[PDB]
Design a protein around this ligand. Structure first.
Ligand SMILES: O=c1ccn([C@H]2C[C@H](O)[C@@H](COP(=O)(O)NP(=O)(O)OP(=O)(O)O)O2)c(=O)[nH]1
Ligand SMILES: O=c1ccn([C@H]2C[C@H](O)[C@@H](COP(=O)(O)NP(=O)(O)OP(=O)(O)O)O2)c(=O)[nH]1
Ligand SMILES: O=c1ccn([C@H]2C[C@H](O)[C@@H](COP(=O)(O)NP(=O)(O)OP(=O)(O)O)O2)c(=O)[nH]1
Ligand SMILES: [Mg+2]
Ligand SMILES: [Mg+2]
Ligand SMILES: [Mg+2]
Lengths: 114, 114, 114
């Protein structure tokens, strides 16, 4: 906060995603349903791109589901992770990488804005 | 019905997704599991693109999960939204925007058709 | 095993995804939560691409959720499908197509590797 996406890092040079961590310690239970986790990272995105927030596989396998999120090109708010404990109680420590941002080309169309 | 994807609209000029609404009022409960919601919008998609159906974040946070769906380039059927109430009873009013279509480049490969 | 992604096939010429089958018969129950299903298919991916593993819609509607998975460009391990039975007991027969691989352009950025 406020940190831009240029501050994120890749696990490795060939990693498709930029890792996202929560800035808070959060405990999630299945009955809580979707929770929006703060990242302290803000849009916007590089020109002609949009973002997809996806889970990391190791986190998904530990029972924390990240719902795929679309980040619009010109979003300037805080990127949050939408997360749910699937079956069990899940504990997110401050700073642990819990999702990833993928950048994709934004295709232009003639669809109207409405 | 039958309406083509060119009829969809963007929330804003920089919105990555084209919004999809259900043409029916639908109530979903968790025990129902995945339901396919009618949109009255039909493929196919622009040349060299395919589609991804994703949830809208505000709808996801209200407890309606949209399962990511792939729309093939030459699909000419009705685009449906695969949806589930996560934890609670969810009510979809006719016309409310419940998902979004994202267009992505379709990469060509030499993989066989089988 | 070890089979490369070039061995996968498309349902049809205009299908966005390359189908993935499990090499094992697997039974899944909701209380099991996420399971990683073996495919016997291995990265890496074509240059300048990364992969997304998504469910097939017919499988999603039958109550088997595939969590979207990111496949890094230079991953050389086995591509596994992360799957959960949503509400009911689901049975995956050996060889049935249970997910699909989508290839997408890998955008280069100046983000650091850390
Ligand atoms: O996982 C997410 C998804 C969205 N977002 C932010 C960025 C995105 O540009 C913004 C809007 O997201 P979506 O459109 O999915 N949401 P919705 O349609 O409900 O809001 P709007 O009508 O403003 O587009 O919410 C996140 O921070 N995390
Ligand atoms: O959310 C979705 C997903 C798919 N679809 C439609 C468009 C897509 O081209 C078509 C086939 O989808 P998938 O392949 O995911 N499905 P499946 O592999 O089960 O059917 P097929 O063997 O015909 O490809 O179903 C939707 O309408 N909504
Ligand atoms: O559904 C999936 C997701 C990932 N994978 C493999 C390929 C991918 O390159 C590798 C790493 O995946 P992610 O990064 O999502 N995982 P995580 O961040 O937990 O591991 P790492 O720190 O190595 O990137 O796991 C699959 O086989 N199936
Ligand atoms: Mg990773
Ligand atoms: Mg929106
Ligand atoms: Mg298919």
């Amino acid at each position: 906060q406020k940190q831009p996406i240029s501050k994120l890092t890749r696990a490795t040079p060939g990693s498709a995603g930029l890792d996202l961590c929560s800035t808070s310690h959060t405990v999630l239970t299945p009955e809580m349903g979707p929770q929006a986790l703060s990242t302290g990272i803000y849009g916007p995105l590089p020109p002609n791109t949009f973002g997809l927030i996806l889970g990391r596989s190791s986190i998904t396998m530990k029972g924390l589901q990240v719902y795929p999120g679309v980040i619009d090109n010109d979003y300037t708010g805080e990127i949050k992770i939408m997360a749910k404990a699937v079956n069990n109680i899940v504990t997110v420590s401050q700073g642990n990488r819990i999702a990833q941002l993928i950048l994709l080309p934004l295709i232009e169309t003639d669809n109207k804005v409405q």
